Structure 1
């Protein structure tokens, strides 16, 4: 069997800026890519980041890394629109959803005409808003548009529930839901290490009336800002997440991960993107786990998912 291009995986990066360059480096070492295409409106930083990354191969599982546009854009198995991103930070704001939504067109339309047929994976803030955005333009169904969000707020959470105690991460379970900052509510009602559970039977009850808890998610959600100093680089933690997430869909792991899905009354919030522990495989997401939120984390959810449906509604008015 003859003339070639042995891939049978493809991934397209749409930002060889920070997050992207890192997503790249990981995808190179963790070894989850069989040809990687790197875009962003420059070309210089991409012939550079390639002749580096591609040098960084005799110590890793081989591929080919280039620089793209959107011709080399089909043959893909994943597309990652990693910080196809505007400038007003995050905390699902209002008019942010504008300054993107044309640099979300300028790059969603031509990765479609060539013959996309995969999963989009938009980690480009504000996320929840965005993946609804990335949905509506693409025509692409209620899963192939995978969001992101939650992933990098739980990973944090975990590793403060961590260091408090001794237990390794990857043991230690608990989520975050809603969006990404300013809304979030830790599902403490789940919260476990080792099959245990924090404060129903053992560590006792409330949050604010005891001295101890909560404090450490008043510095998980604030934990971006606190490194929107020393570089600006909330850029590792995320890229290393877009890799877990990306290895999961594509390796076909029938995994478990929080990521802004599409909500059909897999709560009662419906027709936003906001997110939750869902299950992702090659095709896209298949089945969204829903959570007894107690009575309070039900509220907290209900008033996240409301504050989108106002930034999601004042903006899906396309004609730039």
Structure 2
């Protein structure tokens, strides 16, 4: 069952993101929480042993091989960070090319073993991989709209970080709502809703563009070889932390990609109140500036098409 000692499962724990996430979870999760780390690579048991030497009351266990079932049994939260992250040769293309199958394979296991878990899709491209997860869950007859999330949190860290620097605000207490999708023109930070910031029309377009293209700053600084591994892990840990709090009865609100009312797109990221069933209430986006309003209408076709790509991968 669920809801006694909280149980968190990480599928993709051997990758760059996964290992970093495992570390943060060991240090951040509540005492008593069970942490199951899974990946195909035989190194995974060793990753868990490595993390288990850190003195926190989080119980960590390792799993490898073809079947993630032992790691998923009784899972409350399932974080999927398997597959590849962007790199030099990889465009929107290569991520979907490799990660579409991986996601499907893992979600099929989740649908059988722990269908009532809150599922956090970190693996990119999120706009599409979430639709893949949904369709797989629907085929198995266990899809719960309240428990499937596209982890868009890295766009929030980035927006908070760049906004605080530019406007001289407290970097750790500056809330910036971000809506839409988790890629390119689909990422829309709502700068007009940020408190204590007076915006010249001049700085709106460049800041938005910097938030949207932030991954490229890393990709170019890393001289190609590497993506945003460390910030992605922190974004995932922060989201996981919010999920666990919602499940534990503590109200938290996070902007995340979920199947909402479909006003703009079947799946869409917006403020969500998290609770005991995962989503408790999908909140409105609130008032938008002319700029933000236009950016929203302009992303719709791209966002819808990203979703249709994931749907068609499962439904043909």
Please give the range of the TM-score, normalised by the shorter of the 2 chains: 0.7 to 0.9
- 8 Å Cα contact 1:279-1:285 kept in structure 2: yes
Tell me the number of residue pairs that the alignment of Structure 1 and Structure 2 aligns.
Answer: 296
**CA 1:179–1:91 in 2, change beyond 3 Å: closer, same or farther?**
farther
Shift of the alpha carbon at 1:165? 4.0
Structure number having the greater strand percentage: 2
Give the Cα separation in 2 of the matches to 1:223 and 1:186.
13
Please say if residues 274 and 305 of structure 1, whose CA atoms lie closer than 8 Å, have aligned partners that are also in contact.
Answer: no
**Which deviates more from structure 2 when the two are superposed, residues 99-108 or residues 18-27?**
99-108
Note if 1:263 corresponds to 2:254: no
1:13 to 10, 13, 37: 10
1:233 to partner: Cα distance? 4.1
Q: Which of 283, 297, 300 in structure 1 is aligned with 2:295? A: 300
| Structure 2 match to 1:154 | 156
Partner in structure 2 of residue 142 of structure 1: 145
Corresponding residue number in structure 1 for 2:180? 178
Shift of 1:236: 1.7
Matched, 1:316 2:311: yes
C-alpha change, 1:176 and 1:295, in structure 2 (3 Å) is: same
**1:67 pairs with 2:70:** no
Given that residues 37 and 60 in structure 2 are in contact (C-alpha distance below 8 angstroms), is that contact kept between their aligned partners in structure 1? no
Partners of 2:37 and 2:62 within 8 A in 1: yes
Structure 1 unaligned segments of length 5 or more: list them.
1-5
* Cα offsets for 1:13-67 (capped at 9, x unmatched): 1112111111111111113362211112212x2122112101122xx22413221
Query: What secondary structure is seen at the aligned counterpart in 2 of 1:279?
Result: strand
CA drift of 1:94 comes to 6.1
1-structure distance, mates of 2:287, 2:118? 29
The secondary structure found in structure 2 opposite 1:280 is strand
Q: In 2 relative to 1, CA 297–319 (structure 1 residues): closer, same or farther, beyond 3 Å?
A: closer
Distance in 2, matches of 1:152 and 1:7, equals 30
Structure 1 residue 96: Cα displacement: 4.9
Instruction: Please give the residue correspondences for 1:164-313 in structure 2 after superposition, counting only pairs within 5 Å.
Output: 164-183=166-185, 184-192=187-195, 196-199=196-199, 204=200, 206-207=201-202, 212-228=203-219, 229-230=221-222, 232-252=226-246, 253-265=250-262, 268-271=263-266, 273-290=267-284, 291-313=286-308
> Which residue matches 1:3?
none
Match of residue 54 from structure 1: 52
Moved more, 113-122 or 222-231: 222-231
1:89 and 1:125 in contact (8 A); partners too: no
How far apart, in 2, do the equivalents of 1:46 and 1:24 lie?
A: 11
Distance 2:40 2:47 in 1: 14
Contact persistence 1:174–1:188 (CA under 8 A)? yes
Does residue 107 in structure 1 map to residue 106 in structure 2? yes
- The Cα RMSD (Å) is 2.7
Q: Is the 8 A contact 2:51 2:60 kept in 1?
A: no
What 5-or-longer segments of structure 2 have no aligned partner? none
Larger radius of gyration: 1
2:47 touches 2:62 (CA, 8 Å); kept in 1? no
Tell me, yes or no, if the aligned pair for 1:73 and 1:116 is still in contact at 8 Å: no
Per the normalisation by structure 1, the TM-score is 0.82
Rounded to whole Å, the distance in 2 between the matches of 1:85 and 1:181 is: 16
The 1-side partners of 2:91 and 2:260 are apart by: 18
Cα offset, 1:170, TM superposition: 3.1
Deviation at 1:87, TM superposition (A): 6.0
Q: CA deviation at 1:88?
A: 7.3
Mean Cα displacement is larger for which, 163-172 or 93-102? 93-102
| Higher share of residues assigned helix | 2
Counterpart-to-counterpart distance in 2, 1:218 and 1:154: 14
Structure 1 position 262, deviation (Å): 1.5
Return closer, same or farther for 1:25/1:95 CA change in 2, 3 Å cut-off.
closer
